Amino acid sequence: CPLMVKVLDAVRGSPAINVAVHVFRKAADDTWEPFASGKTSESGELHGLTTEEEFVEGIYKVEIDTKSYWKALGISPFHEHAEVVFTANDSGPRRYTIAALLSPYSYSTTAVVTNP
Amino acid sequence: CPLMVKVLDAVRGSPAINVAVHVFRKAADDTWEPFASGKTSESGELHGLTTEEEFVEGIYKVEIDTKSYWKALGISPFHEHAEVVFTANDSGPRRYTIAALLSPYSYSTTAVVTNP
Amino acid sequence: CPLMVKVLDAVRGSPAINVAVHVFRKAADDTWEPFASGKTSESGELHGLTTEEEFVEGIYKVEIDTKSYWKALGISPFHEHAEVVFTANDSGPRRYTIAALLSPYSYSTTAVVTNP
Amino acid sequence: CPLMVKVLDAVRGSPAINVAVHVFRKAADDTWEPFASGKTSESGELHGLTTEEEFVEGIYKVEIDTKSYWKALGISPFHEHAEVVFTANDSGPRRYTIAALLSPYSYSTTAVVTNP
Ligand SMILES: [Fe+3]
Ligand SMILES: [Fe+3]
Ligand SMILES: [Fe+3]
Ligand SMILES: [Fe+3]
Ligand SMILES: [Fe+3]
Ligand SMILES: [Fe+3]
Ligand SMILES: [Fe+3]
Ligand SMILES: [Fe+3]
Ligand SMILES: [Fe+3]
Ligand SMILES: [Fe+3]
Numbered sequence: 001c002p003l004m005v006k007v008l009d010a011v012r013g014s015p016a017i018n019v020a021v022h023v024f025r026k027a028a029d030d031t032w033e034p035f036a037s038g039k040t041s042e043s044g045e046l047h048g049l050t051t052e053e054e055f056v057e058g059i060y061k062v063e064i065d066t067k068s069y070w071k072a073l074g075i076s077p078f079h080e081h082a083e084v085v086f087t088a089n090d091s092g093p094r095r096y097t098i099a100a101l102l103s104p105y106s107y108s109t110t111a112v113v114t115n116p
Numbered sequence: 117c118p119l120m121v122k123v124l125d126a127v128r129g130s131p132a133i134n135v136a137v138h139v140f141r142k143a144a145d146d147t148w149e150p151f152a153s154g155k156t157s158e159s160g161e162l163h164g165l166t167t168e169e170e171f172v173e174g175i176y177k178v179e180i181d182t183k184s185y186w187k188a189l190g191i192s193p194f195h196e197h198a199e200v201v202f203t204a205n206d207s208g209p210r211r212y213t214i215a216a217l218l219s220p221y222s223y224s225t226t227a228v229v230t231n232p
Numbered sequence: 233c234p235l236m237v238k239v240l241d242a243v244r245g246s247p248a249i250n251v252a253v254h255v256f257r258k259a260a261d262d263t264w265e266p267f268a269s270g271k272t273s274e275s276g277e278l279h280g281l282t283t284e285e286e287f288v289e290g291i292y293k294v295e296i297d298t299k300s301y302w303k304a305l306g307i308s309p310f311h312e313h314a315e316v317v318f319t320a321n322d323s324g325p326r327r328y329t330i331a332a333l334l335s336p337y338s339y340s341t342t343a344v345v346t347n348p
Numbered sequence: 349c350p351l352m353v354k355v356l357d358a359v360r361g362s363p364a365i366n367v368a369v370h371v372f373r374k375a376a377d378d379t380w381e382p383f384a385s386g387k388t389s390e391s392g393e394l395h396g397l398t399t400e401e402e403f404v405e406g407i408y409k410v411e412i413d414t415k416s417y418w419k420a421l422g423i424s425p426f427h428e429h430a431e432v433v434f435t436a437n438d439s440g441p442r443r444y445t446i447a448a449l450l451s452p453y454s455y456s457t458t459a460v461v462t463n464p
Contacts, residue, residue, distance in 0.1 A: 010243075010335035010458070011243050011336055011337070013336065013337030013338075013460055014462065043462065074322070079201045085196040101338060101458060103226075104243060104244070104245065105202075105228070105245030105246075106225065106227075106245075106333065106335070107225050107458070108223070108224035109222065109224075110222040110356065111194045111221045111222070113361045115201070124331065126454035127359050128452075128453070129452065129453030130344060130345060130453075131344065159346060194361055215333075217333070219358035219454070220359055220361065220455075226240060226242055226333060228245060228247065229246060230246065230247065230274075259457075308359070311457075312432075312434070313435040319426050337458060337460070338457065338458040339456075340449075340454060343453050344453070
């Protein structure tokens with residue numbers, strides 16, 4: 001798994017379950033081609049999005065939708081989408097972990113990049 | 117002044133200075149319309165984006181252009197932007213402060229609501 | 233005012249109000265001596281902790297008492313405190329701002345240095 | 349592993365390797381008994397600190413020292429210790445993950461608590 005996504009809730013200190021994640025790649029004619037997608041697990045993690053063979057250098061957009069998570073808590077969320085855009089594998093192949101930390105009025109996001 | 121944006125640099129222990137900030141507002145056809153923009157001062161604050169009477173109820177998006185910020189300091193950062201999305205309610209006159217904390221690989225955004 | 237401490241609540245989207253803050257200074261026998269303390273105002277700011285002439289070069293520690301803060305709001309938080317440790321250099325007159333962002337299970341501290 | 353510790357560098361976006369970690373437990377006569385200790389790995393993680401049989405309810409202090417990490421980067425760090433104090437296993441057994449995010453002027457720390 002070269003690309004992991006974690007989502008956490010800063011209020012509850014728990015993993016965010018069933019967050020929808022959509023990954024896009026910037027395509028040749030200046031548009032976003034679909035690339036991968038999934039839901040986060042009990043542990044709030046999602047990998048198995050791609051393989052090193054499909055995860056070529058390029059520009060990727062990672063979108064999350066947290067509607068299912070707040071719904072199951074009985075929370076009527078105010079906002080529920082977040083996104084990052086980064087450039088991948090420019091120095092050849094790396095593993096990316098992208099973590100998001102949720103509060104109703106605060107959003108934090110961190111990227112860890114490691115060598116496979 | 118009803119809308120403040122404050123931005124800090126976690127690497128250098130200082131306000132982020134001259135960072136461009138674009139504020140959009142969500143329009144009747146669910147698109148984003150430009151609302152305001154500016155650059156951060158030496159103390160990292162940007163205000164004078166809008167008057168009380170022009171900052172109506174709605175959904176607003178603040179894009180802080182951090183890629184150019186880090187690149188100017190000779191750092192290839194991970195993110196393109198820092199963003200946050202928030203809702204202004206039609207309530208009384210209220211101060212909205214958007215605070216941003218920046219690293220090359222991590223950032224956090226927070227919307228703070230007060231009365232002056 | 234050379235030492236400011238600002239504290240925000242990420243859950244409630246507001247300044248943290250009435251939070252106790254204790255500042256210690258590292259003494260000649262490598263122990264911590266009380267330096268200053270106070271409570272945060274309605275805008276979450278605490279200043280008037282020290283004068284320019286009494287805030288000498290050294291190593292200082294800010295303990296923000298967040299357990300009691302969250303418990304007062306009926307939340308059993310994870311941390312006891314938020315802390316940060318920083319060094320004042322003997323340089324010119326400089327403004328030190330300690331900013332704190334608080335959730336029940338996550339918190340961040342930042343020391344910002346400016347000139348007034 | 350009921351107790352994991354991660355340490356990350358927000359400047360480099362990399363795991364912090366060889367961070368020394370010392371865990372203490374609050375003992376009956378109001379003092380800190382040693383409990384567990386270790387160094388973080390290539391991936392910045394440390395588990396194998398304890399077992400569910402030794403990780404009883406109580407008050408634990410987790411200390412890190414990041415001297416070896418900065419040394420190997422050729423960095424003369426200003427500060428290099430951090431600590432959290434929390435109460436464990438009060439609602440019976442839980443798994444704790446404690447993550448710390450480093451910048452020279454900013455420190456963030458998050459706790460994720462999950463059900464084994
Ligand atoms: Fe499972
Ligand atoms: Fe299960
Ligand atoms: Fe995992
Ligand atoms: Fe101000
Ligand atoms: Fe909001
Ligand atoms: Fe002020
Ligand atoms: Fe410092
Ligand atoms: Fe290894
Ligand atoms: Fe290895
Ligand atoms: Fe692991």
